[PDB]
Design a protein around this ligand. Structure first.
Ligand SMILES: CCN(CC)c1ccc2c(-c3ccccc3C(=O)O)c3ccc(=[N+](CC)CC)cc-3oc2c1
Ligand SMILES: CCN(CC)c1ccc2c(-c3ccccc3C(=O)O)c3ccc(=[N+](CC)CC)cc-3oc2c1
Ligand SMILES: CCN(CC)c1ccc2c(-c3ccccc3C(=O)O)c3ccc(=[N+](CC)CC)cc-3oc2c1
Ligand SMILES: CCN(CC)c1ccc2c(-c3ccccc3C(=O)O)c3ccc(=[N+](CC)CC)cc-3oc2c1
Ligand SMILES: CCN(CC)c1ccc2c(-c3ccccc3C(=O)O)c3ccc(=[N+](CC)CC)cc-3oc2c1
Ligand SMILES: CCN(CC)c1ccc2c(-c3ccccc3C(=O)O)c3ccc(=[N+](CC)CC)cc-3oc2c1
Ligand SMILES: [Cl-]
Ligand SMILES: [Cl-]
Ligand SMILES: [Cl-]
Ligand SMILES: [Cl-]
Ligand SMILES: [Cl-]
Ligand SMILES: [Cl-]
Lengths: 287, 287, 287
């Protein structure tokens, strides 16, 4: 009977959602192997939410090895229609400061080595990622931030997230180049997660937590190393207040998302043309 | 006795060449496994042409999983000296409109996960891709287009094709970025096909069929979804007329291509230095 | 008892270091398989240096298949604290001419298919690559060049190296694009080598040998093909004089490098949290 309309995918610094009631863990098997950790289900004011720690318990996974296809497939099997990804990012812009949040509206996928589709091997589909972060969810995030009355920082909307492979932080020349491409924040995880969520017909948007300037800033002075985890911990607690507010808005407003029908004019291979093995592997994504 | 000097690699919307006479299919085994489909051989005015459907019958393959090395190796075994790749593309430029054709002269390889050389594991070679689309074949395509007297659209030469991994269409920020890199059209398939054709000493050029603006255009209005396959079908039939004319010109003119000797000053490992296994795998490419 | 504080990783045209005395070869097993070739140990004026031919004997490896993790791991096991990578590059800038040397201070990793970290599968670490080429070693290289009194060319410092996957040389549009990103030289090998050296806490810098303009120059005239190996051979012999001088300076000056402590605030997984298998695989990199 385990079902949730709304999921939170928690990034660096988010290993649990403390405030959920009647917490219970579910191990979901998928055709893509195991998700990053058992998915936690609980209620935030009677609204059932699924919480998935992207890096697993103890932060055991690097961005490149996160099982993105299992995680999105598992959330699909729970009936999730809305995902909020909560991710630590570096800032590429002077006006986006540590402890600010950013709700990007665009993304550029610079990742190299990640499987970034559920398709292939028997089924062809080409979803549009023109608007890769659902504006109805992004608008909710903006009002959720304001509703949370956060003491530190501000929230910026309409930014571009560039996703890199990792795990190392960027060289200065790479940071300069991402700036020239008009990117605003940098992270390692929201691709291929945004692509996969779209293929799975799930509305997906990102609440980014600015943890520092990328390296385009000479952090050289002895005043940089340990504050950086402490601000990651402060960001994470601010993020929890924002999520509380956002879950409330999604539950009451239930916005229509273009993601919800993304597969239907993108699927090239008719379901009747798929092999038994292909249909079985794609079962939760197909109408 | 199955030999062809000229091959057409057909993209989205091109699953056959109807006009060829004495059609016959050949299954070619290669050291890279099977090509995308049986290669069809037939005569266009007594000129033997090989036709290969890049996506296989029924459009079964996504761009990332096309067996590019098998396809080019197989066409090499038939003695093909000239390839025309016929590919559906998105436009990144206002003046390149749906139903136009584009004959690019440059390419940028943004693909991530494709094996993009026949070399490695026993043999080292570094071919130049400075001019990655043979200008002698591109010039033939331009005159072929004019000779075909196409009713809809115009043909543009001297454009840059950016090849992305796919399968999803680009985000708006990615489209903006490709524009800033001076790319003109976007597709998913002509890399590594152009690199492999060059390593195989085969002259290779692209006839691109504009199927729509990339996403940098708000197709939002209900007036976009189904016309998009119908214009892909119109493009494909216009393309057939162009190919008819181009095969005629290549057959009569037999232009000299720099691709024809591309391997000879690029090969670092002397053939006498290769292992038996390496020589056998590379046999059709070596002098 | 085989130990060296300093290693030279030799690129195209560098298959040995002739001047070392009491040469002896060591085969090092690593958890990442075998290095590119047996590492040669010898003394340059009584200073022990390790010499590793990146492409193996006979130039047998392409850039994509070099075992970068084995090579860096093996040099770590010898106690190497300083690496000079000596690499052939193409120039993207008019003022960087064939036979010049370039000591870059920045790098952009455009490679696609290379394992670019020792981390994952049990251990998470995020080293900063903000300054990816140790300025203390780069400054030594500059003074080493001057000390070597090279007859042909000049040496340029403070350049950006863009690393591409290879093996083909760049299209003109790609060369144009790398110019627009403010890159100065192009090579195929120093990523992921620079990332891995940083994770291994080894100071790493590059002596780049300009072997020609990239393709952004019409080498068309019959005056280009064979001079290109002869200038690669002249570069290589100039490089040996520079290395002689650089080894001397590193040995006497022993500069402190930020690389030397790069792992200590970057490691996320506590050593006590790693599995036996993970600790064993990472043993030489861990404190
Ligand atoms: C030389 C520039 N300095 C070094 C002292 C830094 C320092 C930290 C980062 C971080 C970062 C990551 C985790 C915790 C704190 C930080 C921080 O900054 O202070 C980053 C954290 C994320 C990030 N995004 C880039 C992929 C990925 C999330 C970029 C980051 O860049 C940093 C640069
Ligand atoms: C290799 C990458 N190229 C870039 C254009 C593509 C992209 C899309 C298609 C589509 C297609 C594209 C967008 C949305 C829906 C479809 C679809 O398919 O429904 C197609 C849709 C139908 C189709 N035919 C298969 C024979 C239908 C007769 C072929 C299609 O080919 C495509 C090729
Ligand atoms: C939001 C922007 N709109 C959505 C309604 C579109 C719509 C379609 C495409 C297509 C496309 C692909 C197959 C059939 C028709 C189309 C079309 O456009 O109408 C494309 C087809 C190819 C293409 N190249 C990009 C890789 C690959 C061929 C890009 C395309 O971009 C499209 C954007
Ligand atoms: C790792 C990537 N780097 C970028 C410069 C390269 C690139 C090319 C070569 C070549 C080379 C380059 C272009 C055309 C022909 C050759 C060739 O090789 O014939 C070489 C050609 C000969 C050669 N020697 C092998 C010991 C010949 C003595 C070494 C070569 O090394 C190259 C390295
Ligand atoms: C059309 C442009 N012309 C063709 C005649 C060339 C010619 C050579 C290169 C070389 C190159 C590589 C090995 C030996 C000599 C050369 C050379 O140039 O003359 C290169 C050698 C390295 C290089 N870096 C690019 C990856 C890699 C080392 C780029 C190179 O670009 C070249 C372009
Ligand atoms: C997925 C990519 N994102 C980009 C910011 C990152 C990047 C870094 C961290 C770090 C981190 C970052 C930089 C330097 C040291 C660390 C560290 O870790 O010591 C972390 C350091 C500690 C940590 N906590 C694990 C639960 C400590 C409580 C989490 C960290 O998460 C990171 C995430
Ligand atoms: Cl932790
Ligand atoms: Cl920092
Ligand atoms: Cl179809
Ligand atoms: Cl459309
Ligand atoms: Cl050689
Ligand atoms: Cl040359």
């Amino acid at each position: 009977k385990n079902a949730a309309d709304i999921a939170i995918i928690g990034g660096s610094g988010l290993y649990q959602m403390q405030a959920l009631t009647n917490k219970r863990s579910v191990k979901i098997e998928t055709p893509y192997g195991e998700p990053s950790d058992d998915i936690v289900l609980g209620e935030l004011n009677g609204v059932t939410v699924a919480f998935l720690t992207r890096h697993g318990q103890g932060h055991r996974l690097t961005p490149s090895e996160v099982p993105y296809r299992a995680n999105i497939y598992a959330l699909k099997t729970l009936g999730v229609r809305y995902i909020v990804s909560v991710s630590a990012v570096g800032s590429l812009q002077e006006t986006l400061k540590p402890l600010d949040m950013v709700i990007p509206d665009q993304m550029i996928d610079m990742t190299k080595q990640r499987v970034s589709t559920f398709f292939g091997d028997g089924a062809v589909a080409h979803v549009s990622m023109a608007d890769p972060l659902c504006p109805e969810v992004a608008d909710i995030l903006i009002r959720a931030y304001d509703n949370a009355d956060i003491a530190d920082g501000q929230c910026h909307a309409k930014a571009t997230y560039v996703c890199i492979e990792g795990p190392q932080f960027s060289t200065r020349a790479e940071s300069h180049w991402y700036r020239q491409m008009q990117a605003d924040i940098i992270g390692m995880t929201n691709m291929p997660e945004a692509k996969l969520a779209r293929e799975a017909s799930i509305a997906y948007a990102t609440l980014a937590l600015v943890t520092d300037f990328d390296c385009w800033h000479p952090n050289e002075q002895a005043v940089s190393a340990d504050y950086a985890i402490q601000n990651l911990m402060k960001n994470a607690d601010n993020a929890q207040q924002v999520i509380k507010q956002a879950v409330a808005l999604i539950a009451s407003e239930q916005p229509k998302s273009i993601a919800h029908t993304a597969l239907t004019q993108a699927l090239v291979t008719p379901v009747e043309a798929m092999s038994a093995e292909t249909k079985t592997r794609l079962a939760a994504l197909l109408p």
